[PDB]
Amino acid sequence: FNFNGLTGTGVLTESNKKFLPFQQFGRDIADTTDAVRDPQTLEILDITP
Amino acid sequence: SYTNSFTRGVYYPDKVFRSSVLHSTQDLFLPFFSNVTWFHNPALPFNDGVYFASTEKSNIIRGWIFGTTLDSKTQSLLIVNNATNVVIKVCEFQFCNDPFMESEFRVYSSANNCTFEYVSKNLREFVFKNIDGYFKIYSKHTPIDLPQGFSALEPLVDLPIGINITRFQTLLALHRSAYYVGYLQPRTFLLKYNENGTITDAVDCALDPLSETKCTLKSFTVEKGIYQTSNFRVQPTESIVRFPNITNLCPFHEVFNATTFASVYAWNRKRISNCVADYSVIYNFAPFFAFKCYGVSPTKLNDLCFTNVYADSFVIRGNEVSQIAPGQTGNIADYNYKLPDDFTGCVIAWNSNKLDSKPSGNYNYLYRLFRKSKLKPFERDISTEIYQAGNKPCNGVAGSNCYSPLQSYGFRPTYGVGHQPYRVVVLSFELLHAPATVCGPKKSTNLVKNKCVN
Ligand SMILES: *[C@@H]1O[C@H](CO)[C@@H](O[C@@H]2O[C@H](CO)[C@@H](O)[C@H](O)[C@H]2NC(C)=O)[C@H](O)[C@H]1NC(C)=O
Ligand SMILES: *[C@@H]1O[C@H](CO)[C@@H](O[C@@H]2O[C@H](CO)[C@@H](O)[C@H](O)[C@H]2NC(C)=O)[C@H](O)[C@H]1NC(C)=O
Ligand SMILES: *[C@@H]1O[C@H](CO)[C@@H](O)[C@H](O)[C@H]1NC(C)=O
Ligand SMILES: *[C@@H]1O[C@H](CO)[C@@H](O)[C@H](O)[C@H]1NC(C)=O
Ligand SMILES: *[C@@H]1O[C@H](CO)[C@@H](O)[C@H](O)[C@H]1NC(C)=O
Ligand SMILES: *[C@@H]1O[C@H](CO)[C@@H](O)[C@H](O)[C@H]1NC(C)=O
């Protein structure tokens, strides 16, 4: 996948977290991308390996 | 007046959600418990970002204006709000030095070359910063001299302008019918994130030992113990450069001053050894009708040095000094003394009319004016054979078409400037391969004690 710059690989899944309405993606402790927001529909999706 | 922030001017360093995670950042922040100006207005600086709060149920604060000159001849930003809505704008303006029915806007008087447009109690905080041609604006919205509390500021805008900024102002709505300014520095903070992802508390890793400990542990609660937090290193001041003497000063007072100089055709070459050279005695010596350095700097002579320096001497006529120079032609710079085209020394010459000239003639200063081939750079010839101009052998006797090549100046005291005898001393500098050679003297940095530095 590529989300307007974020390049990665994995399974995408519907989320149930709530970003603040200016945050694009979420990170874990140890700093790995684990959630994104879809630019077009603006919904949060988790990224599992 | 001045006031004290308590914990104010915290903004989300960027996107990316986040929850309970005492996350540590390095950025430009407003340090805790700072000295914020108070205003009840003038041109301020920018220098690195700005915190800016305000308060009033009416709306007296009606935007800011930014830039370097706040006029034409350079570009600036303008952010305004009439009773309608915000108006960002980027042109070259002409701003009132004091810019500010319900009729208004005596702000500027020019709107040229616009490169960006846009149109459309209370405490209102703003953080303005300007990095890589982007002008970022964070802002808040908390309603009730500042008070005391924590409230993180959320990003608002992003403008890819490119504009330079060094100054800014404010805009107010007059009467016809309170604000602060902090500055931002590079600090390191420890932000506590809620489970919804909002910043609820922070620690200024650079305040009191407790905050430096919280920063070192990356937490907001330290349990009892003892923690190594940093290091203490005394600071050294000044740099004392010690060295050895050098006594032996340049024997320049033996070449400039000898009782007699040599003639041009056979000049004297006195080569200088490895010592210390003091040019302060020649630079402040005398009138010096001519003193032109070509390679080395005449005003900074005391800062360079080279392997060996050479000093020549002769006595040439008055109007011929202009031929002792790189790339000249004449009876002097072709047969007697030629300077190369990559010369590096300094040529100097002063008048000596009252010493080397006697009445009834002084025939002891010669100059050769007949040579078969022009001289190569820095060669000296002392031959006195008869120059033969024609086709008939003369076997070494004066006569017709065979002339003697050595002739003498008729130096006399009743001459005009341009025929009186001038003395010349040409210096040359050279660095072949030697590491430590003749060099100028400096200042023996005094040696201090009981004080570390350098
Ligand atoms: C990007 O464009 C798409 C369409 O190209 C937008 O999708 C629309 O979303 C709304 C939901 O509010 C639907 O009612 C429309 O029917 C959708 N249009 C189509 C063609 O499917 C999408 O919303 C746009 N992105 C954003 C952030 O608004
Ligand atoms: C070159 O030699 C002359 C003397 O021939 C020096 O002149 C002396 O200058 C000092 C200082 O002014 C006087 O005390 C002496 O009396 C002078 N000598 C005479 C004979 O009067 C001159 O100083 C020398 N040049 C240098 C650079 O030392
Ligand atoms: C802020 O700095 C000024 C500079 O002179 C000083 O007079 C003033 O006392 C300072 N204010 C505080 C709160 O330290
Ligand atoms: C508010 O100011 C902007 C600045 O140019 C202007 O364009 C706008 O027309 C103003 N509002 C009204 C109602 O005129
Ligand atoms: C900016 O305005 C001045 C005066 O109106 C003009 O001379 C100049 O050409 C303008 N800049 C550009 C890039 O055209
Ligand atoms: C801003 O001003 C500095 C002055 O030191 C200048 O060197 C720099 O080029 C300016 N910025 C831009 C984008 O030209």
Ligand SMILES: *[C@@H]1O[C@H](CO)[C@@H](O)[C@H](O)[C@H]1NC(C)=O
């Ligand atoms: C926000 O946080 C509060 C307290 O941390 C929590 O009770 C609430 O469920 C969260 N989500 C909201 C308000 O949408």
